[model samples]
Target: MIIGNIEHLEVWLPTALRQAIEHVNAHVTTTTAPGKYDIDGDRLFYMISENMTEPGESRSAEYHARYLDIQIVLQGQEGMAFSTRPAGTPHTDWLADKDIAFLPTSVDEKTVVLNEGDFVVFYPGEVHKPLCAVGEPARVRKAVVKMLMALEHHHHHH
Candidate 1:
């Protein structure tokens, strides 16, 4: 649920999150290659793409319970709407192999037009609808990083 720009990201985050932005600072840009990057094995990875911004209804509202997402607009502007995932909210398309699940739109939602260097963080309970257009359909390059935040819960008991 944290929202901030890349300029102050380092001081705003803890060790783990700050570390991720460090990679973004070095590699996330307009000229960066588009694909998956193995930054820190399964715990942390990056997805760089040039997405065509569309209407909100054309895309799905989603939330991830297992990964913290850091989305940054590297090129053009992109519209992203967000809402809170209510308690006991039913979800669809819950893939057991992935961290994402789609949720219905909530009553209260806010939209932000993210320009270059602007970033948004999606925590577990934050439902976000990304890849939306700000004004018209355009190509927006973005860098989205997925960081698994529950590593300390891996307790071995035998």
Candidate 2:
């Protein structure tokens, strides 16, 4: 499972990541279509597409064994559920067929609300279920940038 503090994100990510973040924050104004871009250098860097959901819609719990996920909300609002619960043991893997598996959990599960200009990063160790619209159907603009890295990558870097 991947783990790291948000403050250390820029240290590990390529310069394009910062540019991508700026690009997203600037151009991505609406909740209808979220922005996405990829910068491949030493590793496979991907700017995953953002999704908007109505209240009661589940983003589905998912994880990637590879890559560290940096989730940033450029606009709107939503709640994301996270947990360290083991998959497929006590919990049922809803989407086992996909690369990212999902499990059903309670409504009051651990959540982080993202508003305009708010952002949150999640590691593989932290399984997340995003795009949870609170109250009623609402618009949300967000992006997930996956910084692909090897297991051997040092924990500390200059």
Candidate 3:
């Protein structure tokens, strides 16, 4: 997991990871609507989220099988929980078609509070709990950019 403000992502992300989001514009606004915004097709894209954050312990933790997620807080504060080690059993999610699975229970979790302009990056193996409220339930608008890990190796395939 990588946590940094939207202004200085270049310094926090590695060379390969930095390049992954190089083309993404961090200036996404609050009214961007909840829907998918394509960047490089399935290889890279962003989806906007407009919803209310739930209480900290009420949300579920999840991990993705395919992409690196860059979650950016565009309008309000959000509480993000991360676990470096895999925990709990994987259950199918309604959005399982998108490769997302939930970790119903976890033994270890670290929390972070993200305000407007803050962003965090999560790799495929890391379990993360997003859309949690910082202190109380509040509406938030976030932009999550999905970057495929194999994108850098595009030249090696047909």
Best model per TM-score: 1
lDDT by residue for model 3 over 3-38, one digit each (tens)?
887667666477755654555554355455689888
Could you tell me the C-alpha RMSD of candidate 1 in Å? 4.3
TM-score for candidate 3: 0.82
- Residues 8-116, model 1: lDDT tens digits: 7655476777778788888765578889997989889989998799988645687776778899888888888987544235467463466667766666767888888
lDDT of each: 0.76, 0.54, 0.74
The whole-model C-alpha lDDT of candidate 1 against the native structure comes to 0.76
Worst 10-residue stretch by lDDT in candidate 1? 149-158
TM-score of each: 0.85, 0.62, 0.82
Candidate 2 local lDDT, 1-158, one digit each (tens): 33332223456555655554655455444543433455555244435355656543444566554455667765667776666554332244323243354555645457667675555655444567778777776766566666654665322211
User: For model 2, what is the error of residue 3's alpha carbon versus the real structure, in angstroms, after optimal superposition?
Assistant: 13
**Clashes in each model (backbone N, CA, C under 3 Å)?**
0, 0, 0
RMSD of 2: 6.6
- Candidate 1 pairs with clashing backbones: none
Off by over 4 Å in 3: 15-23, 93-97, 151-158
